[PDB]
C-alpha cells in the first residue's frame, strides 16, 4: 500500500544552473533528499528562508561559497548550511543533498548569477 522505495529510473532528472538534479518524487514534509551531480558549478547564488541545505560529498572535490566565505569540500565531507545563508558552489562532485524542512521553491530568493569562467573546475 505504502511506497517506501524510489529509483533513479523513475525520478525526474534535469539541469539547474549547471548542476544535474535527481528528484525522486517522494513526499515528506520534514525533508527532501535529492542527488546532485556537478561538473563545474552551480552558477547562481541563492538563499532559502526556511530550509537548511546539507550536502554529503560522495565523490570528487569542490568549494562552497557560503555568505561569500570559501568552504573547501572533498569526498566523505558533510557541508551543513543554515537557512538564510547565501549559497553557490564550484566543483566536480557527486553529492546527496538534504533540504529540511521539505524543499519549496517559494522559500528561495535569487541573489545573483555567477559567470561560468569563475569556476576553477
Ligand atoms: O528539491 C530540490 C533541492 C534543491 N534544488 C536546487 O538545487 C540547487 C542547489 O544545490 C538550487 O538551485 C536549488 O533550488 C531543487 O531544485 N530541488
Author numbering: 1 to 121
Wording from the paper:
In pacidamycin 3, biosynthesis the 3′‐deoxy moiety is mediated by Pac13, an enzyme found to catalyze the key dehydration of uridine‐5′‐aldehyde 1 to form 3′‐deoxy‐3′,4′‐didehydrouridine‐5′‐aldehyde 2.
Mutants E108Q, K16R, H42Q, Y55F and Y89F were produced and purified, affording diffracting crystals of the same morphology and space group as wt Pac13, which raised our confidence that the mutants folded correctly and that the effects seen are specific to interactions with each mutated residue rather than global effects on protein folding and structure. The kinetic measurements for the activity of Y55F and K16R demonstrated lower affinity and catalytic efficiency than wt Pac13. Finally, the significant loss of activity with mutants Y89F and Y55F is consistent with their proposed involvement in stabilizing the oxyanion and underlines their important role for catalysis. Similarly, on examining the Y89F–uridine complex and Y55F–uridine complex structures, we observed a high degree of similarity with the wt enzyme. Although there are subtle shifts in the position of both the ribose and uracil rings, of the substrate, and in the orientation of the 5′ functionality, these changes are small and consistent with our hypothesis that decreased catalytic efficiency of these mutants is largely due to inability of the phenyl mutants to stabilize the transient 5′ oxo‐anion that forms during catalysis, rather than having a major effect on binding competency.
